[PDB]
Design a protein around this ligand. Structure first.
Ligand code: SAH
Ligand code: SAH
Length: 667
């Protein structure tokens, strides 16, 4: 006999499958979407079941028909000689994929086929065979495409990816058949060291070890689809089985190289170790619990080999960027001369390695697009532009900030126009704020470089992207304690560039009645309050920012009747108000119905009504090119002394946005 077979595989693997079938004897192989049709004699059927590492399932087409009625399928199914095919007492199951105008539901199709099969027994007065979906002895597949159903015996039984070293469920993050592909694409030469420092369940390393010691994927499988079937040939199966034993033993006894796996998670490593032991190859592989950060080359004196792995992906994250960036640095340092292959769902994260891949492959892993890329690591740059600038600013501002008593400040303010980003330090945290795949990888480089210059821990870096759950952070500004939130708002709750105007209010405050309009989180009120203000009044339209202001006042012991918070539109509040204040801070947005340039004079007109004799208004804004109407003011009997230069902090000295600042008083 010449038999006709079909092997299914994952899309993308078909050509690799066909070569593997050919290498083991198969003839007339033709790739097709999701599989390979092939031929060989009966030893060849058994040899492909035992030996194929890429096949998901191997089956035997039994026939095919057109399906234009429940009847056609029924007739079509009964053409095949079931009663003679089943061993006595064999259980069965039917899996049916695909649909047409008559079989509009798959489970329906599986049902009609199952019924047609049972009816081959009824019509010959035989005991009806039972179904066992869990572990049938006979599995029948049918594939319906366009108008044709194709029926086939599944010879694999369980999927061929189960090699007998795991759990039949299971759910591996990478199927065994895909992991064997990855090893084949990796450039890894069997017989040279292989290492995976993020090894998970160890699957990559176990497939590799089995491939390299000629250990058949089938060697340890406990069950096959051919055992319930009458045409089965035990003596040929026995001969394939004994050929497998012989080759495994020699493969193992002769292998002289080694496999190294490591992973940070102690649970997976215990599973990796039991898996490998059950694969038969456990003596060839060493697993340890170890972070990529302490990765070392166990063979510093050679021979070179391959580092093969499947890193975590963004399931933008600073921790991932840092993990990829450090891996590249460790490759270069520890594994010069070696081959590197990586399977990832994030090409952008692979770019953080700072290596150029000389080969790549696309593969689906379930629903996810992944790539595998291979690289050569040279024997014995990185936005050095930004790096040097940032190391400079760091030396400069760290010292300046220590002298001034400042712990939140701007480390970098788009100083180089090709690295157009702000980096703000808040105590032990850092926020990088973007302004600007090409783009994304440049951003990643900036993040890697900034994590590396600062010596900061990745989880303490927050990325605010060009494109709200959690936590507030307590910070100081000279003597104020303030709450910030680095992630949930467009801003952090503290406008850092205005710290000096804030410190000044605090010096001008002793026994003063203070008013703060457009107060935001009330940081200026906290400075006034701690300067001995006799009462503070803090106003803003936002209930959230007023709650946050109150929490800031509370943080510095400023509670009770003397410290008020008022939710209002500040302009209508100004129209109607009567009380008087000695010190007034008003620092509005440029627009909100309100226009600072247009309306400032009319604010000063109302503010005048509220300013107690001898009092001062500190007015500020950040409208670009703002013009103070000095004539309007003098007409109101007010004068204005610009203090903009005196209130400029060093960390913001080169910034475009100018925060203009004025002391207004009685003429
Ligand atoms: N910093 C670090 N050092 C070492 N291992 C890490 C790490 N960060 C994450 N990991 C590990 O990286 C792994 C990525 S998932 C690996 C899946 C694996 N190839 C398989 O076939 O089963 C996880 O096991 C996680 O524990
Ligand atoms: N018409 C209006 N009346 C009252 N508050 C307003 C407003 N329009 C905007 N605001 C508030 O103005 C603030 C702008 S942020 C101003 C910065 C703030 N003065 C500080 O010292 O930190 C926000 O808190 C916003 O809610």
């Amino acid at each position: 006999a010449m038999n006709s077979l079909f092997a299914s595989t994952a899309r993308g693997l078909e050509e690799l499958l066909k070569t593997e079938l050919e290498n083991l004897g198969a003839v007339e192989c033709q790739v097709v979407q999701g599989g390979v049709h092939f031929k060989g004699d009966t030893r060849l059927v058994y040899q492909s079941l035992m030996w194929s590492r890429l096949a998901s399932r191997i089956m035997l087409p039994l026939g095919e028909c057109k399906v234009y009625s429940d009847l056609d399928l029924y007739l079509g199914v009964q053409a095949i000689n079931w009663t003679e095919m089943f061993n006595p007492g064999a259980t069965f199951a039917v899996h049916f994929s695909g649909l047409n105008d008559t079989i509009r539901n798959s489970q329906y199709g599986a049902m009609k086929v199952k019924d047609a099969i049972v009816d081959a027994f009824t019509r010959k007065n035989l005991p009806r065979p039972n179904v066992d979906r869990d572990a049938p002895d006979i599995r029948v597949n049918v594939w319906l495409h366009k108008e044709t159903a194709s029926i086939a015996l599944d010879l694999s039984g369980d999927g061929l990816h189960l090699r007998g070293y795991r759990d039949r469920a299971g759910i591996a993050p990478i199927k065994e058949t895909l992991a064997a592909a990855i090893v084949m694409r990796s450039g890894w030469q069997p017989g040279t060291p292989l290492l995976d420092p993020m090894c998970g369940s160890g699957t990559l390393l176990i497939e590799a070890a089995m491939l390299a010691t000629d250990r058949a994927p089938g060697l340890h499988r406990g069950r096959w689809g051919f055992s319930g079937w009458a045409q089965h040939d035990e003596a040929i199966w026995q001969e394939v089985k004994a050929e497998a034993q012989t080759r495994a033993r020699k493969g193992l006894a002769e292998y002289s190289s080694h496999f190294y796996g490591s992973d940070s998670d102690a649970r997976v490593i215990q599973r990796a170790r039991t898996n490998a032991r059950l694969a038969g190859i456990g003596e060839l592989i060493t697993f340890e619990v170890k972070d990529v950060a302490q990765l070392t080359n166990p063979l510093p004196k050679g021979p070179y080999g391959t580092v093969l792995s499947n890193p975590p992906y963004g399931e933008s994250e600073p921790a991932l960027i840092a993990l990829h960036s450090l891996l590249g640095r460790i490759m270069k340092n520890q594994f010069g001369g070696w081959n590197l292959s990586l399977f990832s769902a994030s090409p952008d994260l692979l770019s953080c390695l700072q290596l150029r891949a000389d080969k790549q492959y696309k593969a689906k892993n379930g629903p996810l697009d992944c790539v595998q890329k291979n690289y050569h690591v040279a024997e014995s740059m990185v936005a050095e532009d930004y790096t040097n600038r940032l190391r400079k600013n760091l030396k400069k501002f760290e010292k300046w900030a220590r002298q001034e008593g400042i712990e939140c400040y701007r480390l970098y303010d788009a100083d180089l126009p090709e690295y157009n980003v702000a980096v703000d330090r808040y105590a032990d945290w850092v926020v990088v704020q973007e302004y600007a795949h090409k783009a994304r990888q440049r951003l990643f480089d900036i993040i890697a470089a900034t994590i590396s210059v600062l010596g900061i821990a990745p989880n303490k870096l927050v990325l605010k992207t060009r494109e709200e759950k959690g936590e507030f952070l307590e910070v100081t500004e000279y003597n104020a304690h303030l709450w910030v939130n680095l992630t949930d708002y467009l801003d952090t709750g503290l406008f850092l560039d205005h710290r000096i105007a804030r410190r000044m209010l605090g010096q001008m405050s002793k026994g003063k009645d203070f008013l703060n309009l457009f107060s935001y989180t009330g940081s200026a009120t906290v400075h006034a309050g701690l300067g001995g203000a006799r009462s503070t009044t803090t106003v803003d339209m936002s209930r959230t920012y007023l709650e946050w202001a109150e929490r800031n006042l509370r943080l510095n012991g400023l509670t009770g009747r003397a410290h008020r918070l008022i939710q209002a539109d500040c302009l209508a509040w100004l129209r109607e108000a009567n009380e008087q204040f000695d010190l007034i801070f008003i620092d509005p947005p440029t627009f909100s119905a309100f226009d600072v340039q247009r309306d400032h004079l009319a604010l000063m007109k109302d503010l005048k009504r509220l300013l107690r004799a001898g009092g001062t208004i500190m007015f500020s804004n950040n409208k670009r090119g703002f013009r103070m109407d000095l004539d309007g003011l003098a007409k109101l009997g007010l004068k204005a002394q610009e203090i903009t230069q005196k209130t400029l902090s060093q960390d913001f000295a080169r910034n475009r946005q100018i925060h203009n600042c004025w002391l207004i008083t009685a003429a």
